[PDB]
């Protein structure tokens, strides 16, 4: 036995991320016609869901664990743009072109910005 | 005399003096007690007189618990004055007593002396009380 005493950086990252997410969520939400594009991000993968908060359901989703996205030899920005175009295509198939961006409690930029601008050019107006 | 060190408000309304004592109706500290039967305002004058009465009667060794505190002030406007010009200045202190509340409690070896000291105290109070024992 070796009882640890401190708090781990995982806890502070996770719950501070959740607090930022909730503060954000106080002001955006998803309908059927203008759903919410929520994003997760880790050291390996980036995830997106298209949510109708009236139900708590998901309309479309994507991540960087699909076959094609793992088929890219490029950079994390390349995976981000691939996910963005894929989720834009899936949303357009589902019958929607307007959305609100839930950045997920991460600062807007880097790969999240790349994803968001890929979806922007791909057909989703936000 | 028993006087609170400070009260948040020094001019309150008269304590509502209705109902039966719900809290503080059992003898717990000593073995014999004086337990009330009528609503009243037991001032610190009454309490001091009753306590000195008990101490004079037993006079040897035994514990007297005054488990009521006079901490509610009754005011009185100065004499010869008409009505109006606001409420008076507080000048005596009171415990609000309901029928049921044990007022004084005593611990002493024997029986008759304890009973007699308790009734000596009772005679100094503005109410009817009765001597109650530690058992049902």
């Amino acid at each position: 036995a070796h009882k640890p005493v401190g708090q781990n950086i995982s806890e502070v990252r996770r719950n501070a991320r959740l607090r930022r997410h909730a503060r954000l969520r106080k002001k955006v939400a998803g309908t059927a016609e203008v759903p919410r594009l929520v994003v997760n991000r880790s050291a390996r993968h980036i995830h997106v869901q298209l949510v109708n908060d009236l139900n708590g359901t998901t309309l479309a989703a994507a991540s960087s664990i699909e076959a094609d996205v793992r088929a890219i030899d490029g950079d994390k920005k390349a995976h981000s743009v691939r996910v963005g175009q894929l989720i834009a295509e899936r949303a357009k198939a589902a019958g929607v072109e307007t959305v609100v961006f839930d950045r997920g409690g991460y600062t807007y930029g880097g790969r999240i910005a790349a994803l968001a601008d890929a979806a922007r050019e791909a057909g989703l107006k936000f | 005399m028993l006087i609170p060190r400070k009260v948040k408000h020094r001019k309150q309304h008269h304590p509502e003096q209705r109902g039966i004592a719900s809290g503080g109706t059992s003898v717990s500290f000593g073995d014999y007690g004086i337990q009330a039967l009528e609503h009243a305002y037991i001032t610190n004058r009454q309490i001091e007189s009753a306590r000195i009465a008990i101490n004079r009667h037993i006079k040897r060794g035994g514990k007297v618990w005054i488990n009521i505190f006079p901490d509610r002030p009754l005011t009185k406007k100065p004499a010869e004055t008409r009505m109006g010009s606001g409420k008076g200045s507080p000048e005596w202190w009171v415990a609000n007593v309901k029928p049921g509340r044990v007022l004084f409690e005593l611990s002493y070896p024997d029986e008759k002396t304890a009973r007699d000291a308790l009734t000596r105290a009772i005679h100094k109070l503005p109410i009817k009380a009765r001597i109650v024992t530690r058992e049902e």
Binding site: - | M1, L2, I20, A21, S22, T25, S28, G30, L37, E48, R51, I52, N55, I58, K59, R60, G61, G62, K63, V64, I66, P99, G100, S107, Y108, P109, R134, E136
Partner: protein, 192 residues
């Protein structure tokens, strides 16, 4: 040391309320409720006189044998709602119990004997909680005072506890404290 249960009669309350309870209390009857693991809160009138008699004979904590319309049940007094003034018992609570059943209870502690003369013995906690079987419940247990030395405290952990019974209270709960008898120049110095 099994205690023989006491045999009362009871009968189901037809209708409930403060009016019904007042009327029943007026006819020399006590309203009461059975519960426990019998999982049926059953509303029972019982004889007030016999209830008081058995509570006198065997304290607050005593097993009863209730005859509910012919059915035979074992009960144990859980609580008694008593008027502060008229002192009549108003209501009773009856856990259902059976043999070989541990149950938590509160037992009065009555100091026995005389103490050393220069000081007075005074109890702070008159009741001590014990875990014990339904039949083996002591109605009262004693604490020893026989010429103690100068003022000292007594706690539940050093009491001669009966057999088959277990202390529940934390052992460091004071029960009886011998405190030096106030002198002539010490008794009237406190209280003002």
């Amino acid at each position: 040391t099994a205690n023989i249960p006491n045999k009362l009669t009871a009968n189901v309350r037809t209708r409930t309320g403060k009016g019904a309870s007042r009327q029943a209390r007026r006819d020399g009857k006590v309203p009461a409720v059975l519960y426990g693991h019998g999982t049926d809160p059953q509303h029972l009138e019982l004889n007030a006189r016999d209830f008081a008699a058995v509570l006198r004979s065997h304290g607050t904590n005593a097993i009863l044998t209730l005859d509910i319309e012919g059915t035979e049940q074992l009960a144990l007094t859980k609580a008694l709602d008593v008027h502060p003034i008229r002192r009549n018992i108003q209501h009773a609570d009856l856990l259902v119990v059976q043999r070989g059943e541990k149950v938590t209870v509160e037992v009065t502690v009555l100091v026995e004997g005389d103490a050393t003369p220069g000081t007075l013995v005074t109890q702070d906690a008159n009741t001590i909680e014990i875990e014990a079987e339904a039949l083996s419940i002591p109605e009262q247990l004693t604490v020893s005072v026989e010429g103690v030395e100068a003022g000292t405290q007594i706690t539940a952990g050093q009491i001669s506890l009966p057999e088959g019974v277990n202390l529940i209270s934390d052992p460091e709960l004071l029960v009886v404290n011998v405190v030096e008898a106030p002198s002539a120049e010490a008794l009237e110095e406190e209280g003002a």
